[PDB]
């Protein structure tokens, strides 16, 4: 059995979810500083109990139920920044598409408390690309990710135009390198075979669907802002929110028109409130492209370039 070292080069922010979402009430958003202080609830509650501010917090939550940002409440009663750091877990960068944030999706962290990309998530992606029992393929969990490489991004849907939405997720910043250890057997899987299949899968993804978003005006703005990297090609959308083409082997295999019709049928079967109301197959299925930054560059969610080293 041969072994290799997988180098995941993050060209688009990657968010491996943890199953836990928080709201603007739970954490701190310094808009002027443009930083999101992720806090843990028990410490904040005990701090407010010690300071006697917990009743004020409950009243503030009651007053504006829909919008109850913690930062505005703490500014209301003038709580010191060090008092924040008492209960604040850690701060994160902010890249807001829209103002204040709405819903935050937390990254996956192990018991030791470090960020890491799980092996199973990489294995699933490589299985989606490689299918057509994967016991021979093995992916180790990633080496822990430095917290400096984590930042909050805002997801922008592009249905021929950019649209800010209440999507904010903790993602690995672009330019980050992630290390995995991969072991395969010579008989069943070949490293060259899987790399070639990754390349062909990305080529299909580009030809079948990506051009159908490039032609769009919002896609044109996405490209002009730098959303499409010059380099991107062993591309694999490892993260969550990459899109319907990603997470689905069938679109690449089916003829562009046949695949579009089948995807439209599936989406109408599942999501009747959006695609069910649509009478005909759109030019591109799915309709919207699946992220901006403080810099000039635009990004699409979850883009990665793999690099296997023996």
């Amino acid at each position: 059995e041969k072994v290799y070292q997988v180098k995941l080069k993050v060209y688009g922010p990657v968010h491996i979810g943890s199953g836990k979402i928080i709201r603007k009430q739970e954490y701190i958003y310094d808009r002027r500083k443009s930083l999101a202080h992720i806090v843990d609830g028990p410490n904040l509650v005990k701090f407010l109990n010690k300071k006697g501010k917990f009743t004020a917090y409950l009243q503030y939550l009651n007053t504006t139920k829909e919008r109850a940002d913690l930062y505005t409440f703490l500014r209301q009663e003038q709580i010191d920044t060090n008092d924040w750091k008492t209960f604040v877990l850690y701060t994160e960068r902010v890249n807001q598409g829209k103002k204040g944030m709405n819903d935050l999706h937390l990254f996956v962290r192990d018991g030791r408390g470090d960020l890491y990309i799980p092996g199973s998530s990489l294995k699933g992606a490589l299985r989606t690309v490689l299918e057509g029992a994967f016991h021979s393929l093995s992916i180790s969990d990633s080496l822990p990710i430095d917290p400096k490489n984590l930042a909050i991004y805002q997801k922008i849907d592009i249905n021929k135009e950019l649209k800010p939405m209440p999507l904010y997720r903790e993602c690995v910043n672009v330019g980050t390198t992630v290390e995995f250890t991969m072991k395969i057997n010579s008989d069943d899987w070949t490293i060259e075979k899987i790399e070639k299949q990754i390349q062909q899968a990305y080529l299909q993804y580009w030809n079948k669907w990506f051009v159908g978003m490039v032609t769009t005006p919002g896609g044109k703005a996405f490209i002009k802002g730098g959303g499409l990297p010059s380099v991107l090609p062993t591309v694999l959308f490892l993260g969550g929110g990459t899109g319907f083409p990603s997470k689905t082997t069938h679109y690449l295999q089916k003829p562009k028109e046949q695949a579009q019709k089948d995807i439209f049928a599936i989406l109408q079967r599942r999501f009747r409130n959006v695609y069910g109301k649509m009478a005909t197959v759109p030019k591109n299925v799915p309709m919207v492209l699946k992220v901006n930054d403080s810099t000039n560059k635009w990004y699409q969610q979850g883009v990665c370039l793999l690099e296997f080293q023996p």
Binding site: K20, E26, G41, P42, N49, L61
Partner: protein, 135 residues
């Protein structure tokens, strides 16, 4: 576990009672559109369950029957989260007020026992299961 208002017992049977009391057909367009707790969807129920699940597994890994101060603060934040979710959505408010959940977690804090917390988590789990069954 505990007792709600008017001395009524809180059990898994009472969880079925609560879920069926707010269960109504309300058929629309000649098609059955099951309504639970006035528009409460499964997603909100599952979010509340997961909020329970965190401190559940935290207590499950513990050996001592007494709830540690970490569990106490987790339950305080659980009350905060339940109040916030009820304020955000009227359906969640209806579910919380009908199910007496915050009273139950206050009783759990009062008892400071692993068994009462388990029973509360089981009652919350029952409510979720019943809701899934009747939907």
């Amino acid at each position: 576990l505990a007792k709600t208002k008017t001395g009524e017992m809180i059990d898994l049977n009472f969880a079925r009672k609560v879920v069926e009391e707010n269960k109504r057909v309300k058929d629309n367009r000649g098609r059955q559109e099951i309504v639970l707790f006035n528009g409460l969807t499964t997603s909100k129920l599952r979010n509340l369950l997961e909020l329970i699940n965190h401190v559940y597994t935290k207590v499950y890994n513990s050996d001592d029957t007494t709830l540690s101060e970490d569990v106490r603060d987790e339950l305080e934040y659980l009350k905060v989260k339940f109040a916030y979710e009820s304020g955000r959505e009227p359906a969640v408010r209806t579910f919380i007020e009908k199910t007496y959940v915050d009273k139950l977690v206050d009783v759990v804090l009062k008892k400071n026992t692993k068994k009462i917390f388990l029973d509360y988590c089981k009652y919350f789990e029952a409510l979720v299961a019943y809701a899934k069954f009747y939907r």
